Every structure is written in structure tokens, then in C-alpha cells.
Symmetry: C6
Subunit: 68 residues, 6 copies
């Protein structure tokens, strides 16, 4: 179901891992994951922007991450 | 489309009438205040309003920080 | 909920609109009719427009909104 | 679907030449042979199955009268 | 309802097909199998193609629908 | 859905080198670490999470069981 996505985003959230989010148009967003629901992710930097998952290509952490 | 934190976040932006930038999947940038929204669309006000499809939005960026 | 009556007002009141497509294309006309997935837009040429291909709908004048 | 289906159906029955514009800007042409909930079968000069999700607009060569 | 038999007929008759992606890339091969969301397109190796990425499917020779 | 899963699982368990082509034309290379209904974790020098909706095609570097 969400058995990979949730713990992945959640781990990045709890550990405040700096991430780069890449959009399908090729824009690179940067910050940390503040929050997420089944459709969006709140990306924190200057302010917290809301990113639609449907617009995301990849999420790439700035360092390796242990899934729980 | 409509879920656990997208709604409260968008509702907050509506209620506090915070100017936002809305970036579309094709890179175009819209600006305005969120008048209202449902599961699929968002009404964005300036001269006349405009109905923006959620499916075409990549990110919503508030002009100043905001509390969730 | 919000989409349907908003389109309906534009339809019922014959309001000229610009429909911008996700690829940048700007279509113009008046909304003849619509359903859950498409919008039929007339004048110049008539055409059936998929909603999934639309980014925004911009009326040529302010609209009653509720 | 109360608009889409009879619209395509009429185009289908009356063999109306149509131009189908893809979301990527490409124009397909021909007549509709059949369709279902997700695809459209387009015939003649080039015969081919089109996914609805890649379609932006269907522009018939002449307006259609709905039943 | 029409997608299935069209793809099955192309499959069973080993018709070589051209699959155009929404980004404009053209893939070529034979349909090995398929399900609700993807198509397995056979050639050098078999690649998995997401339907959501496909714009058109064009057979190299005419298909007789059953 | 009955076909995407076993295919990905095979690539995963045999740790087969793969290229993943995104809907925007970008090519990613690596190996499938894991996956669920919506995302694929792609391993390499830097691991990353890839939404299926952004993928056009998965292409293994060698032929695989089907
Ligand atoms: O922003 C969020 C945060 C959390 N969740 C979801 O909430 C559920 C619980 O998320 P938690 O992170 O609260 O679980 P936890 O008990 O491990 O956290 P701590 O109390 O130890 O800090 C998880 O299933 C996660 O997917 C979200 O969906 N979005
Ligand atoms: O345009 C809108 C407005 C509101 N809503 C949704 O309607 C629900 C009620 O939204 P409200 O914001 O009106 O309820 P509230 O009680 O929080 O407001 P106040 O009395 O404090 O003024 C909320 O869940 C909101 O997300 C929309 O979905 N779209
Ligand atoms: O092309 C259309 C027209 C109308 N409708 C939908 O069909 C329903 C009936 O559409 P009507 O246009 O008959 O409703 P009405 O005039 O009675 O509405 P009010 O003046 O009372 O506001 C409305 O809910 C509309 O959203 C469509 O779905 N497509
Ligand atoms: O390729 C097709 C053809 C037809 N149909 C759908 O099959 C149904 C039967 O379509 P028909 O064309 O066989 O019946 P009809 O139009 O004479 O009947 P009415 O629509 O006047 O009631 C119609 O609802 C049509 O939309 C498809 O879904 N795909
Ligand atoms: O790779 C495949 C092959 C087949 N199928 C689907 O499984 C069902 C059985 O497909 P078959 O092709 O095994 O049935 P059959 O030999 O009796 O040929 P038809 O009567 O279907 O013409 C058909 O509905 C087909 O669409 C797939 O979904 N994927
Ligand atoms: O990253 C993964 C790995 C595995 N899976 C899926 O979860 C299940 C894990 O199953 P496994 O691949 O670990 O074992 P198996 O099914 O071959 O062995 P049995 O348990 O059937 O005896 C399989 O159904 C696989 O498709 C994922 O969804 N994501």
C-alpha cells in the first residue's frame, strides 16, 4: 500500500534530513520534510511550501537513510 | 486532491488571506489569494478570479510564513 | 461542489472564457456544456476539452461565485 | 460522462473527421472507429489506439448535433 | 472493453507495434503481455511500460478486431 | 496489477541492474531496492525514492525470468 512511502517520508521527517525534491518539470526543491498526507508534502525552507505528490518525480536525501 | 493536511493548510491560507504563489506543472506562476477550494479546484483571486485545477499545480508557496 | 456551479454560471450566463491547457495552449470561447471529465467549448471552432489537460479557467469578467 | 460518451458516439456513427490534439502538442487525424472508458480507436491514414489521458482536445471537422 | 482485446489481439498475433510515449519517445517491439497498468514490450530485453506514460499504440499492420 | 509486482520483485530479488526512464525523459540507473503500490526505492551511489507516476519505462540490463 503505502508500506514503503510512509516510513520513508516519516523517517526523513523525524530525523530532519535535508532533502532535494525533483519535480517532473525538472525543478529542484530543497529543504526538509515538515509533514505529509496521502496527496501532499509540506517542504520547509524560507517558508513551508505545499508540494503536490503528483508533481514529484524523485525524492533524494542528502545522506543515506535507514528505513525502520 | 483533498486530505489530512492539504485542507487545513489551504483553509489557513484562505482565512488569513495570505497572498500565495501557485506554480503550475509547466512552470507558469500564478499569484493571488485563495478565495475557496474543493477536492479538485482552487479559486484564485486578483482582477477576476480564476479556477485552477489541482492536478495542474506543482506547488503552493505562501508569501509569508504561516501556522498549520 | 465548487467546480460544478462555477462552470454552470459561466455556461448559463454565456460568459466568454480563456481555458489554459497544461502545455501552455490558450483556448477561447464560451462553455456550451460539461460533465465530470470534459468541457465543450464553442465559438471560433467548437471542441471537446479534457479537464485533465486544463490548468486554469479564466473568465473575461467577474462572476457570482457561491 | 453524460456529455463525453454521446459526443464520441455521434462522431463515431456519423464518421465525422476529427483532429485529436495530444497533451504534447501533436495532432492526430482521422475518424473514430470505436472507444471505451479509457481509449479511442482512430482509423484511416494511420490506424491507432489513443489513450484518453494523453488527449487535450477533440476538434471535429464539423459541429455535432447531440441526441 | 476495447483496450484489452486490441492489446490481446496484438499480443497473440505477434504484431510489431510502435508505442509513442507522451514525451514523444517512440518504443518498438512486440507485446509479450499486459495488465491493468503496464505493458511488457519485447525486444532485446523485455521492458516494462507504464500505460500512464503512453500516448498512442500503432501496429505495423492492420488489426482485425474479433 | 497482477504483472507489475512479480516483475519488480524479480528485479529486486536478483538485484538486476536496471535503467528507469522518467516521463520527462530523464534516465536513472541502479537497482530496485524495494517498492510498494506507488513508489520505487532505487539504489545507487545515492539512493532515492521514485514515484511510479513519474516513470515511463523500466528496462533491465539483461534478460530476466517472466
Ligand atoms: O506528517 C505526517 C506524520 C506522520 N504521519 C503518519 O502518522 C503515523 C504515525 O506517525 P508518528 O511519526 O507520530 O509515529 P511514531 O509513533 O513512530 O512517532 P513518534 O511518536 O515516535 O514521534 C505514521 O503512519 C505516519 O505514516 C503522516 O501521515 N504524516
Ligand atoms: O473553500 C473552502 C472552505 C472551507 N472548506 C472546508 O470546510 C470545512 C469548514 O471550514 P471552516 O473554516 O468554515 O470551518 P471553521 O469552523 O474552521 O471556520 P470558522 O468557524 O473558524 O470561521 C473545513 O474542513 C475546510 O477545509 C473547503 O473545503 N473549502
Ligand atoms: O452541461 C452541464 C450543465 C449542467 N450540469 C449540472 O446539472 C445540474 C442541473 O443543471 P441546470 O442548469 O438544469 O441546473 P439549474 O439551472 O436548475 O441550477 P440553478 O439555476 O438552480 O443554480 C447542475 O447541478 C449542473 O451542475 C452539468 O453537469 N453539465
Ligand atoms: O465504440 C463504442 C461505441 C458505443 N459505445 C457506447 O455503447 C452504447 C450503445 O451505443 P450504440 O450506438 O450501439 O446504441 P445507440 O447509440 O443506438 O443507443 P443510444 O445511445 O441512442 O441509447 C452507447 O452508450 C455508446 O456510448 C461505446 O462506449 N463505445
Ligand atoms: O497478457 C495478457 C494476456 C491476456 N489477458 C487477458 O486475459 C484474458 C484471457 O486471454 P486469452 O488470450 O488467454 O483468452 P483466449 O485465448 O480465450 O482469447 P480471447 O477469448 O480472450 O480472445 C483476456 O481477457 C485478455 O484480455 C491479459 O490481461 N493480459
Ligand atoms: O519491496 C517489495 C518487496 C516485496 N513486495 C511484495 O511483497 C511480497 C513479499 O514476498 P517476497 O518476494 O519477500 O517472497 P515471495 O512472495 O516470493 O514468497 P512467499 O511469501 O510468497 O512464499 C510479494 O508479494 C512481493 O510482490 C513488495 O511489494 N515490495
Amino acid at each position: 500500500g503505502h508500506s514503503l512511502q510512509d516510513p520513508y517520508l516519516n523517517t526523513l521527517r523525524k530525523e530532519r534530513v535535508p532533502v532535494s525534491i525533483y519535480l517532473v518539470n525538472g525543478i529542484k526543491l530543497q529543504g526538509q520534510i515538515e509533514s505529509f498526507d496521502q496527496f501532499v508534502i509540506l517542504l520547509k525552507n524560507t517558508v513551508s511550501q505545499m508540494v503536490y505528490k503528483h508533481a514529484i518525480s524523485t525524492v533524494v536525501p542528502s545522506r543515506p537513510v535507514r528505513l525502520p
